[PDB]
Amino acid sequence: DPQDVVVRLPDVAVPGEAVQASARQAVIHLVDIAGITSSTPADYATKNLYLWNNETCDALSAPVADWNDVSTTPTGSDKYGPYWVIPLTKESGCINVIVRDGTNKLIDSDLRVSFSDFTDRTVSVIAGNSAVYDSRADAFRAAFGVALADAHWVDKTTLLWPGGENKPIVRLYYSHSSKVAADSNGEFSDKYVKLTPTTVNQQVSMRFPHLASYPAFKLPDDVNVDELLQGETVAIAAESDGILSSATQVQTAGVLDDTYAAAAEALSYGAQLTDSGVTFRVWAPTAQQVELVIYSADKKVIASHPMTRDSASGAWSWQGGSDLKGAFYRYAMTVYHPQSRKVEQYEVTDPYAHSLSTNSEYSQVVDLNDSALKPEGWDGLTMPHAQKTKADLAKMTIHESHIRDLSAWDQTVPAELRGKYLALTAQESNMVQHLKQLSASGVTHIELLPVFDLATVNEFSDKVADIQQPFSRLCEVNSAVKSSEFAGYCDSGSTVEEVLTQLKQNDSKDNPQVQALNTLVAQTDSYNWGYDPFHYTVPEGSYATDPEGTARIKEFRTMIQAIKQDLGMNVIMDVVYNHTNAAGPTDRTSVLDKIVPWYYQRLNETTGSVESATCCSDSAPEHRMFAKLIADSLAVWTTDYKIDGFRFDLMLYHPKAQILSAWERIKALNPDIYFFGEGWDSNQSDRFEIASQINLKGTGIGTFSDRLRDAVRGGGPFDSGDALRQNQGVGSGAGVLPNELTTLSDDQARHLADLTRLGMAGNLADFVLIDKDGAVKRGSEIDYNGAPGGYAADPTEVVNYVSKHDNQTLWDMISYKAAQEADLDTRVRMQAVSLATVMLGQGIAFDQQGSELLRSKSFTRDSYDSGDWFNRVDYSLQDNNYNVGMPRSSDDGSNYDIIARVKDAVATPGETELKQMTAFYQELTALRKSSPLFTLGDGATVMKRVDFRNTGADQQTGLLVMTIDDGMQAGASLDSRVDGIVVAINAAPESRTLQDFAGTSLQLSAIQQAAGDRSLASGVQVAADGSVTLPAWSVAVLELPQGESQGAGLPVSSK
């Protein structure tokens, strides 16, 4: 088309520098983009700089602090703009500048000119842009070149772009093999499509509501999208004469979904065994070439196959023989990546990989149904615990565990199984026997921290050193140790563990030496929580005895079978679909973003940079093919690994619709699978309806409740310093046993009691209780940091807990918070009292591995990379890992002062306390499952049967009294043995007497009577008249015994 105006650069040269700063000088160019378009010779008399020294930048020589002084006018100027020569006292550091016309800012931003980064101290700026450029050419190309990525090709015919609104020429340029750039004639001569303004359709605004305010443009219905998506596309806008306004890169995930997803969703992906052979398929709708590279066991290329592109789906496939089973493979990609703007060439593992080589370098063809990859009996393995009804689900009592935390320290686990899946098969080890005991007593589910393929442990054992090994080994594999203050131990002949123990003696807030060595250990040990996804649907390799090939698959299943069959527990996996470990075209662990660049990651709407609000490389579960990958991945964990439930990490970054979609998909495989996650606020509500506590009401999708958690623990996860001690919780005596720093008022204490009672009734929005002032409140009317406290529809949608892998352990919180006068035995009872609010509540019960052993991390708040030393759990019951060194200073350094003040208040728990806490713990879990009344499942049923005494403004502070009705006003007798239950948690130093049940023949539960002196209710007195005397820091479960008819019980009061 020749009538089309040709888009071109300004008909002016790219500018050199006006002047170059001399000694004790800096030079600022203002590149006058408007006057480069020229017309009228520009007048710069009113341009001026405001120059001042503060504390961070002070190099200016004679800065005039008078804001109203506009006399710092240009030193000179040429056709490209003015420049300023600025005297200096020094050529290092920086200067502060605001660029003005008169007193108005041309750049609404205090500028810092760093001599350290601009060594010739000669920089350029442009009006309306806070960026400091090294040269006018750079700034010039910034203004008249490609920049950012704010154009959004969202379906076949709709481009959303700011830069093109009310511009005469708006075009989508595209180049198959090079980056769209101006000619030798300054002309953009690459091929393009023409764009005409239009109106955002309803389907596009529904799909992309965060973009609905973007100026919309239409493409011809006959544009060949497949051709444009093969290379670079750049949206370009231009004036009426053809001069370039702006040019930006294009985000294409919307049009990729509109063009390909319907066809692509019908296909299955990865290396798939069939009856004819093996079918390979990978989704790569923008790739120019995909070659399947086949590797021998020793990683030699033994074949290379150009794959067949299916043009409806953008998937690539190839079919080979059945003998390819066990073979290693990668996809050789030829694909444009917008981040580098190059057509990249690299081999990538399969995102649908189901088996891996060591350290995930190669994917491997596997048939997960092979009986060689199954323990004997696998196919008939069943759930030891039902999950079918809401009452089934409410019984869930979760023990959140980590593969190394379980066995790394257990000398009774065979050495070669320590830190391995197979440690769970060590039937006589302390660890497994302790777990069996916990299961007999009513822990029902093991929840496993990441056992999918994580990135952050090196699976080549030669490159790893663990604290149980010689310190010389640590030196060999970690070259930083050589130049560390611990270098001398390289010759010591002792283990790293022996050195860390030795370092305990002089370790202090002033000499944090244990943490110092451990930070080096952490770089090259086997330890990480593993919230760092490499491949979503392969087991982690470092947890296998053999990480090379399929061995880990059978070992994983042997563990799963042992937990269900040897230990009697169901299994929940933590899954982390909300982010990838890395993105872009070069990083070793960028898998998804090498194959389909900019599709699987969530990007900033204007820069196209991968967002990091999760921590890392944010994913895009709102995109259709990643939603499919998630669902397909869960299908394998469900069917092929027999996982009973999934906990979604940062579920709030997922659309509600996508989570429910995945759930219906998985429920069609197994109807009893349970989904829950972290449903905080992801700040993504502008893009879709997030999968949050609030939005998931009624769905049956569970969420961690932070309500009872914070009320019982005290404070919040972002407390530091004195606040860690001041913010006592119900479990540590808020308002009844104050420590020396706190100012908690009685009203504040009663408010925590409201959140705790609300949580023990399942944290429902509609539950009705009497609040701290004696007023009638619905759950949703109790405040929690401004949000409605109660949010659920059924208690199965709420997971209560007072300790978790992240943030401080319960014991460390009690240690921060307990008054000096609380002795060691009282603190053990505070731990049990805290856990009682979870274990005796209607919400699903969740707890950190080792709360029953008073688990400590030496005050470490965030132990994800703190190794075996700080995450130690001692199943030989010698101690609780308390006081083993100051925690990592980079995250807890601002807590050293309060740590040192509170740390040594009482002795460190030893074997007597550990056994006592475990008995306490098993007493609580046995109580939880002793009656269906504790686990009613259905919220309306909770509302009809659960009530509280000792409420209102004159309540006895810290005394929690819950009643569960099994009498006629409620409905049927769900429990044949009792007409009602009373739960009384006396979180207080005073003994207390209940008269609410005078005359009722109330009696103590048989479980607690049988524990005798060892019971949380030791010393409870039930008088003849039915009054109950509760010791300090006690938990009592009482019951109305049943006679041969459902009695009156404990009718809920209508309020």
Ligand X SMILES: OC[C@H]1O[C@@H]2O[C@H]3[C@H](O)[C@@H](O)[C@@H](O[C@H]4[C@H](O)[C@@H](O)[C@@H](O[C@H]5[C@H](O)[C@@H](O)[C@@H](O[C@H]6[C@H](O)[C@@H](O)[C@@H](O[C@H]7[C@H](O)[C@@H](O)[C@@H](O[C@H]8[C@H](O)[C@@H](O)[C@@H](O[C@H]9[C@H](O)[C@@H](O)[C@@H](O[C@H]1[C@H](O)[C@H]2O)O[C@@H]9CO)O[C@@H]8CO)O[C@@H]7CO)O[C@@H]6CO)O[C@@H]5CO)O[C@@H]4CO)O[C@@H]3CO
**Binding residues for ligand X, per CB under 6 A?**
52, 54, 65, 67, 98, 110, 680, 706, 716-718, 720, 785, 806-807, 862, 891
Tell me: does residue 866 bind Ca ion (CB under 5 A).
Answer: no
- Torsion sign over Cα 807, 809, 812, 814: positive
CB 333 to Ca ion: min, Å: 22
Count the helices and strands in the chain (H runs, E runs).
27, 49
Could you tell which of ligand X, Ca ion, none binds residue 720, using a CB distance below 5 to 8 A set by kind? ligand X
Residue from 58, 110, 134, 392 in contact with Ca ion (CB under 5 A): 134
Of the candidates 582, 564, 573, the residue with the CA atom closest to the CA atom of residue 382: 564
Residue matched to tokens 């050495």: 415
Contact 467, 867 (CB under 8 A): yes
Q: Both tokens of residue 610?
A: 């991968």
CB 449 to ligand X: min, Å: 15
Contact 982, 1050 (CB under 8 A): yes
CB 9 to Ca ion: min, Å: 22
Could you tell which of ligand X, Ca ion, none binds residue 527, using a CB distance below 5 to 8 A set by kind? Ca ion
Q: Both tokens of residue 69?
A: 């002084």
Could you tell which of Ca ion, ligand X, none binds residue 859, using a CB distance below 5 to 8 A set by kind? none
Of the candidates 919, 713, 762, the residue with the CA atom closest to the CA atom of residue 396: 762
Strands 328-337 and 363-364: antiparallel
Of the candidates 162, 146, 578, 623, the residue with the CA atom closest to the CA atom of residue 339: 146
Nearer to ligand X, 687 or 888 (CB): 888
Could you tell which of Ca ion, ligand X, none binds residue 252, using a CB distance below 5 to 8 A set by kind? none
- Phi/psi at 664 (5° precision): -65, -40
CB 692 to ligand X: min, Å: 10
> DSSP string spanning 606-653?
TT-PBP-TTSSEEB-TTSHHHHHHHHHHHHHHHHTT---EEEETTGGG
Strands (E) located in 918-1041:
946-949, 959-965, 978-986, 992-994, 1003-1004, 1021-1022, 1028-1030, 1034-1041
Task: Exactly one of 678, 710, 794, 965 is catalytic; name it.
Answer: 678
Q: Which of these ranges, 224-232, 261-269, 447-455, 473-481, lies near Ca ion under the rule CB under 5 A? A: 447-455
Contact 553, 373 (CB under 8 A): yes
Q: Which of these ranges, 115-123, 654-662, 884-892, 939-947, lies near Ca ion under the rule CB under 5 A? A: 115-123
CB 685 to ligand X: min, Å: 14
Could you tell which of ligand X, Ca ion, none binds residue 346, using a CB distance below 5 to 8 A set by kind? none
Tell me: does residue 349 bind Ca ion (CB under 5 A).
Answer: no
Tell me: does residue 527 bind Ca ion (CB under 5 A).
Answer: yes
Nearer to ligand X, 295 or 653 (CB): 653
Residue matched to tokens 């030893």: 910
Tell me: does residue 966 bind Ca ion (CB under 5 A).
Answer: yes
Tell how far CA 78 is from the center of its chain. 53
Q: Clarify whether 574 is annotated catalytic.
A: no
Could you tell which of ligand X, Ca ion, none binds residue 453, using a CB distance below 5 to 8 A set by kind? Ca ion
Tell me: does residue 453 bind Ca ion (CB under 5 A).
Answer: yes
Q: Both tokens of residue 242?
A: 């053809």
Task: Exactly one of 649, 862, 966, 979 is catalytic; name it.
Answer: 649
Residues 493-522 that bind Ca ion (CB under 5 A): 522
Nearer to Ca ion, 400 or 525 (CB): 525
Could you tell which of Ca ion, ligand X, none binds residue 120, using a CB distance below 5 to 8 A set by kind? Ca ion
Tell me: does residue 122 bind Ca ion (CB under 5 A).
Answer: yes
Nearer to Ca ion, 195 or 211 (CB): 211
What is the C-alpha separation between 61 and 89, in angstroms, rounded?
Answer: 5
Q: Which of these ranges, 174-182, 186-194, 480-488, 859-867, lies near Ca ion under the rule CB under 5 A? A: 859-867
Nearer to ligand X, 272 or 720 (CB): 720
Tell me: does residue 548 bind Ca ion (CB under 5 A).
Answer: no
Nearer to ligand X, 169 or 449 (CB): 449
Q: Clarify whether 812 is annotated catalytic.
A: no
Nearer to ligand X, 716 or 774 (CB): 716
What residues contact residue 832 under an 8 Å CB cut-off, 6+ apart?
A: 917, 920, 921, 924, 1016, 1035
What is the C-alpha separation between 953 and 830, in angstroms, rounded?
Answer: 24
Instruction: Provide the terminal-to-terminal Cα distance of the chain, rounded to the nearest Å.
Output: 78
What is the C-alpha separation between 689 and 759, in angstroms, rounded?
Answer: 25
Of the candidates 828, 984, 759, 875, the residue with the CA atom closest to the CA atom of residue 438: 875
- Phi/psi at 610 (5° precision): -65, 125
Strands 702-704 and 798-800: parallel
Could you tell which of ligand X, Ca ion, none binds residue 706, using a CB distance below 5 to 8 A set by kind? ligand X
Residue 1019 Cα distances to 293, 1009, 1011, 1036, angstroms: 73, 10, 11, 10
Could you tell which of ligand X, Ca ion, none binds residue 979, using a CB distance below 5 to 8 A set by kind? Ca ion
Other beta carbons less than 10 A from residue 623's beta carbon: 21
Nearer to ligand X, 395 or 888 (CB): 888
Nearer to Ca ion, 350 or 525 (CB): 525
Tell me: does residue 120 bind Ca ion (CB under 5 A).
Answer: yes
Tell me: does residue 466 bind Ca ion (CB under 5 A).
Answer: no
Of the candidates 737, 682, 688, 698, the residue with the CA atom closest to the CA atom of residue 714: 737
Residues 974-993 that bind Ca ion (CB under 5 A): 979
Could you tell which of ligand X, Ca ion, none binds residue 966, using a CB distance below 5 to 8 A set by kind? Ca ion
Of the candidates 979, 981, 960, the residue with the CA atom closest to the CA atom of residue 1035: 960
What residues contact residue 220 under an 8 Å CB cut-off, 6+ apart?
A: 157, 193, 194
Could you tell which of ligand X, Ca ion, none binds residue 522, using a CB distance below 5 to 8 A set by kind? Ca ion
CB 53 to ligand X: min, Å: 9
CB 574 to ligand X: min, Å: 14
Nearer to ligand X, 382 or 785 (CB): 785
As beta bridge partners, residue 170 has 237
CB 671 to Ca ion: min, Å: 30
CB 675 to ligand X: min, Å: 18
CB 134 to ligand X: min, Å: 24
What is the C-alpha separation between 194 and 1, in angstroms, rounded?
Answer: 11
As beta bridge partners, residue 247 has 146, 236
What is the C-alpha separation between 731 and 827, in angstroms, rounded?
Answer: 9
Nearer to ligand X, 717 or 788 (CB): 717
Could you tell which of Ca ion, ligand X, none binds residue 1034, using a CB distance below 5 to 8 A set by kind? none
Residue from 286, 728, 955, 973 in contact with Ca ion (CB under 5 A): 973
Sheet with 270-273: strands ordered across:
270-273, 278-283, 315-320, 308-309
Contact 841, 761 (CB under 8 A): yes
Residue matched to tokens 């490209």: 80
CB 600 to ligand X: min, Å: 20
Nearer to ligand X, 585 or 715 (CB): 715
What is the C-alpha separation between 262 and 106, in angstroms, rounded?
Answer: 49
Nearer to ligand X, 98 or 284 (CB): 98
Could you tell which of Ca ion, ligand X, none binds residue 110, using a CB distance below 5 to 8 A set by kind? ligand X
Q: Determine the size of the site formed for Ca ion (CB under 5 A).
A: 16
CB 54 to ligand X: min, Å: 4
What is the C-alpha separation between 286 and 899, in angstroms, rounded?
Answer: 55
CB 806 to ligand X: min, Å: 5
Residues identified as active-site: 649, 678
Binding site residues, Ca ion, CB under 5 A: 120, 122, 134-135, 453-454, 522, 525, 527-528, 541, 865, 966, 973, 979, 1046
